[PDB]
Design a protein around this ligand. Structure first.
Ligand code: CLF
Ligand code: MG
Ligand code: MG
Lengths: 465, 473, 113
């Protein structure tokens, strides 16, 4: 009677949305590019609220501009707001190189011709700044489909199309392209170490390491993406693409395969031990480079740590997970490796027809010994309502906008994915890879341990485990 | 004079928005343009009209569904971002609602989607019987008639009451338009649609206070001590139905004249309720305000007992901070009113010199007030943008900036500390105790070892790492 | 001297008071007249008007100003009743000039609130 079931939310409305809309994800893609300021064509909230969201997750400012759509543009069209916004950016930011022009619900409904505005602005910019090149990428992100997950993927693809259209194929680079998806700076730091230890040259798109920027004696601001125009252009010349996230950049790997014959390898997102193992085996396959002893050791240190926890504290404990689809499916697999039982998986957008085909579903169907409900098109009320109706959970894993569900239900909660604003430093802590699996397992245990103390639930047992 | 900053040489229209107050000027010749269109591409701090209606005003209420008719982003974006507690477990902060508009609703209309969402929300939370519905950009563009849908829902569900606001983000130029549409709709439709028991000889509404970190609950300890019944708070720690009773008050006390002056003005026009403007931030300001309220009611002695007690309790701490904050330079980059509520109160009560101020969305009215109260040599900026903020820092070298968290995290890189001028650090900030809380946070922000440590380059052989000695009131 | 006294009163009102900065011309005019008539009564020992709610509110605003003027300005306890009246008439005129006649606030005459 052992069943993994997919079902949609049964309400038309949303209470407590899991994700933001497409333009927010497009903004996130863009802020990882060096010398990039996205221009969000729509009303002002579509920009300012998302800059706040990034400040909540990262505790940093990122630069994004608005076209400031007002009432006259709503009657007559907003092309002149785009055109003005591009020139005002170029004139006031002399080092600016890349402007993704991101549409919103408003500017999709009114049908402004973004590509026509880009032709105008390219002519204007070439005349006014003869020795400068600014890349204007059209990013179509209506908010009434998909989510910030889809918007991220669309923006990455559009930027890559724009820049590679301009530079084409050159000399082979010998490098990998790597699209990790929507991950933290700590995940990027871990991936760079893995490629360094394996002696594999790679560009990570986007390289967000420096989002965790120092406060320096010289008062310098370093809070920027590290991925340059040149890095993106060089993607045409790669040996191969490693795509870690089906829903967060694999479509750019495919585009590069179609356009430039760079072979794309999509692998399971590397949450947990097996998925990391399989990622490293694919890297070895495509590069001919051996997996180093250092990664066998990091793997062994992670397993050693998780073995102190799994049968003692985790076995038979029931977990609900919410977040981006690649993260939810990957964390469900990690959970199983450590004897946790992920009985409720919530994925927050309208992409169910794709999720039903995800091979990780089948990997769960063939392995779980407990029923799993996967709710797609879910909101966070879908979690709260199930708890109120009697679902017994030992743990929630998800982002901070679900915090009150866990607090009020008195269920321990580990903060994963985006945004994680209600704890300190999580953006710096890997979640992927072997060290990430270890860090996740130890967050889970430490959340359970604190819960045992606050609730006086066998709190004396934390001595000789 | 009016100022053309170097970063605005290619947008020189910005000079009419920036005033540097100089000796002997007739300030009537130098009033910034305000409440005009934004320049695209500037990194203006402005938000949208929907924000001003739902996030700022309507969403403060403790017992009301906030139904955002539009795609899900407008809902996501106004959830987990405000600090307005309630006395019912923070219902207002725990939830947000969307009609989850999809492409088919753009094509065919969203009215049935809204109607279904509204019934679902009432079904999911059977204890909640009040709702505000807001339009957003695309639902305005497709012409959904949310007032007509709300009328049908109320007919079908006679135990609910629904209010509607037409506030797409492209309306107006900023949050301000949302304030106006909400205020006028509420007084036109919902005031005097029920009544409550009057339990005091002295009754008032408190208009334009949104309970940031408990401000409203702190002020309520004053009204309870004075024996004044507050018919309605607009909208801090408020209820939908209290707001229906606003016509019953004898007096309207206004703090936020920008967001909420509209409804005070209409209550005076329609019901004869006088409008009293106060400053509920600032120590000596709070005393003036209590004295005015008590003079209106004829309870002067009770006012002087409360003031005396509050001064005995809090003035020694306030003066401790003044000794240490005297001469520090402050910038205030917020919505608008806090500029004119704070510039002279920090000067009087803390000795702090406000050297630069920027208003996201203030009107010319707000600039009249701030320039009247503010110092010579100070910059007064309407609709400031990020590059201007950097240039202003270079001109005035503030010791502390009161602004939102994102800007605070930016200026941290320049070793300038911030206090959250919107949601506070450790509030409340209104009232006598509140101004001490504000002073404490300013003191701990500036006299902070980390700021000194950041300046040391450990590679410089010539440099040592200092220790600083701090204090506490 | 009479112009110094008026300059003192005007600088006090500008930096302290809010009632001259209401949303519309007609409200500024009402408040300037109403508050300052009460101030004149209070500074000359006359019985304040406290009948109607509006009168009671002008009294409340005026009391703050009268008390502050007596505390700040020694001259305000030395000049006679007619001199106080003349100063307050001059102050009304100045306040109308700067808050209405020469204000560039473009909302002041909008018929709707
Ligand atoms: S200016 Fe304001 S916040 Fe912007 S849309 Fe308009 S009412 Fe709303 Fe909404 S769903 Fe996302 S965030 Fe926008 S693109 Fe539309
Ligand atoms: Mg060990
Ligand atoms: Mg003055």
């Amino acid at each position: 009677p052992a069943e993994v079931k997919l079902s949609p939310r049964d309400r038309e409305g949303i209470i407590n949305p899991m994700y933001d809309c497409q333009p927010a994800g497009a903004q996130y893609a863009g802020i990882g590019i060096k010398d990039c300021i996205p221009l969000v064509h729509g009303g002002q909230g579509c920009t300012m609220f998302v800059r706040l969201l990034f400040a909540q997750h990262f505790k940093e400012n990122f630069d994004v501009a608005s076209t400031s759509l007002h009432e006259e543009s709503a009657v007559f069209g907003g092309a002149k707001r785009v055109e003005e916004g591009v020139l005002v950016l170029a004139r006031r930011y002399p080092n600016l190189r890349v402007i993704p022009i991101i549409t919103t619900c408003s500017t999709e409904v009114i049908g402004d011709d973004i590509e026509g505005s880009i032709r105008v602005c390219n002519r204007a910019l070439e005349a006014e700044f003869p020795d400068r090149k600014i890349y204007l990428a059209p990013v179509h992100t209506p908010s009434f489909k998909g989510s910030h997950v889809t918007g991220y993927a669309e923006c990455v693809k559009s930027v890559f199309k724009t820049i590679t259209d301009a530079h084409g194929k050159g000399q082979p680079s010998g490098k990998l392209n790597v699209f990790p998806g929507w991950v933290n700076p700590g995940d990027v730091v871990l991936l760079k170490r893995y490629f360094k230890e394996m002696d594999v040259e790679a560009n990570i798109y986007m390289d967000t390491e420096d989002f965790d920027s120092p406060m320096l004696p010289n008062k310098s601001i370093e809070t920027h993406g590290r991925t340059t125009v040149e890095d993106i252009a060089d993607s045409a010349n790669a040996l191969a693409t490693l795509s870690l996230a089906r829903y967060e950049g694999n479509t750019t790997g495919e585009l590069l395969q179609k356009t430039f014959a760079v072979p794309n390898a999509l692998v399971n997102t590397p949450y947990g031990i097996k998925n990391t193992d399989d990622m490293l085996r694919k890297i070895a396959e495509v590069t001919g480079k051996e997996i180093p002893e250092s990664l066998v050791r990091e793997r062994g240190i992670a397993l050693d740590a998780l073995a102190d926890l799994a049968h003692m504290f985790f076995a038979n404990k029931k977990v609900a997970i919410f977040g981006h689809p690649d993260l939810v499916l990957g964390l469900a697999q990690f959970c199983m490796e450590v004897e946790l039982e992920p009985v409720l998986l919530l994925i927050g957008d309208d992409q169910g027809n794709k999720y039903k085909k995800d091979p990780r579903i089948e990997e769960l169907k063939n392995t779980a010994h407990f029923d799993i409900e996967i709710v797609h098109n879910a909101d966070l009320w879908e979690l709260e309502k199930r708890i109120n109706a009697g679902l017994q959970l030992d743990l929630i894993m998800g982002h901070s906008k679900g915090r009150y569900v866990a607090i009020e239900a008195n269920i321990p909660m580990v903060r994963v994915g985006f945004p994680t604003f209600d704890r300190a430093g999580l953006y710096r802590k890997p979640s992927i890879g072997y060290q990430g699996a270890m860090e996740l397992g130890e967050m889970i245990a430490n959340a359970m341990f604190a819960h045992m103390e606050y609730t006086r639930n066998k709190e004396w047992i934390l001595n000789t485990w | 004079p009016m100022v053309l900053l170097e970063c605005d040489k290619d947008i020189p229209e910005r000079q009419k928005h920036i005033y540097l107050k100089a000796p002997n000027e007739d300030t009537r010749e130098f009033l910034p343009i305000a409440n005009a269109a934004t320049i695209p591409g500037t990194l203006s701090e402005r938000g949208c009209a929907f924000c001003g209606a739902k996030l700022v005003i309507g969403g403060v209420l403790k017992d009301t569904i906030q139904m955002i008719h539009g795609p899900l982003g407008c809902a996501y974006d106004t959830w987990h971002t405000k600090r307005y507690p309630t006395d019912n477990g923070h219902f207002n902060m725990k939830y947000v609602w969307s009609t989850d508009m999809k492409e088919s609703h753009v094509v065919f209309g969203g009215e049935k989607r809204l109607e279904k969402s509204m019934h679902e929300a009432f079904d999911e939370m059977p204890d909640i019987k009040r709702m505000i519905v807001y339009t957003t950009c695309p639902t305005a563009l497709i012409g959904d008639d949310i007032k007509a849908v709300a009328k049908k829902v109320m007919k079908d569900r006679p135990d609910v009451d629904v209010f509607t606001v037409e506030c797409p983000g492209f309306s107006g130029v900023s949050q301000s338009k949302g304030h106006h549409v909400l205020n006028i709709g509420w007084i036109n439709e919902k005031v005097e649609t029920m009544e409550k028991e009057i339990t005091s000889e002295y009754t008032m509404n408190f208009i334009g206070d949104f309970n940031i970190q408990g401000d409203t609950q702190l002020l309520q300890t004053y009204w309870d001590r004075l024996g004044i019944q507050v018919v309605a708070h607009f909208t801090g720690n408020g209820t939908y139905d209290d707001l229906r009773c606003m016509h019953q008050a004898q007096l309207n006390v206004v703090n936020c004249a920008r967001s909420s002056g509209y409804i005070a003005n209409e209550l005076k026009k329609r019901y004869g309720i006088p409008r009293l403007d106060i400053d509920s931030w600032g120590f000596n300001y709070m005393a003036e305000g209590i004295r005015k309220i008590c003079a209106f009611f004829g309870i002067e002695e009770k006012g002087e007992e409360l003031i005396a007690e509050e001064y005995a309790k809090w003035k020694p701490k306030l003066d401790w901070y003044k000794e240490r904050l005297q001469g520090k330079k402050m910038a205030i980059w917020t919505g608008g009113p806090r500029l004119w509520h704070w510039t002279k109160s920090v000067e009087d009560d803390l000795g702090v010199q406000v050297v630069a101020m920027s208003s996201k969305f203030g009107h010319e009215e707000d600039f009249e007030k701030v320039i009247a109260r503010g110092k010579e040599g100070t910059y007064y900026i309407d609709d400031g943008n990020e590059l201007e903020f950097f240039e202003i820092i270079d001109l005035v070298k503030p010791d502390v900036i009161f602004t939102g968290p994102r800007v605070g995290e930016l200026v941290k890189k320049l070793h300038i500390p911030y206090v959250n001028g919107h949601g506070y650090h450790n509030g409340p900030y209104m009232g006598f105790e509140g101004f001490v809380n504000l002073a404490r946070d300013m003191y701990n922000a500036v006299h902070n070892p980390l700021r000194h440590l950041a300046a040391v380059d450990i590679r410089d052989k010539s440099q040592t790492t200092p220790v600083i000695v701090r204090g506490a009131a | 001297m009479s112009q110094s006294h008026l300059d003192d009163l005007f600088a006090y009102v500008e930096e302290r008071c809010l009632w001259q900065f209401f949303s519309r011309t007609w409200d500024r005019e009402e408040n300037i007249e109403g508050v300052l008539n009460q101030v004149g009564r209070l500074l000359t020992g006359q019985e304040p008007l406290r009948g109607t709610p509006q009168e009671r509110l002008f009294y409340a605003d005026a009391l703050a100003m009268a008390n502050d003027v007596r505390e700040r300005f020694p001259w305000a306890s030395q000049v006679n009743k007619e001199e106080i009246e003349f100063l307050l008439d001059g102050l009304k005129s100045r306040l109308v000039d700067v808050t209405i006649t020469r204000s560039t606030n473009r909302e002041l005459n909008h018929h709707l609130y």
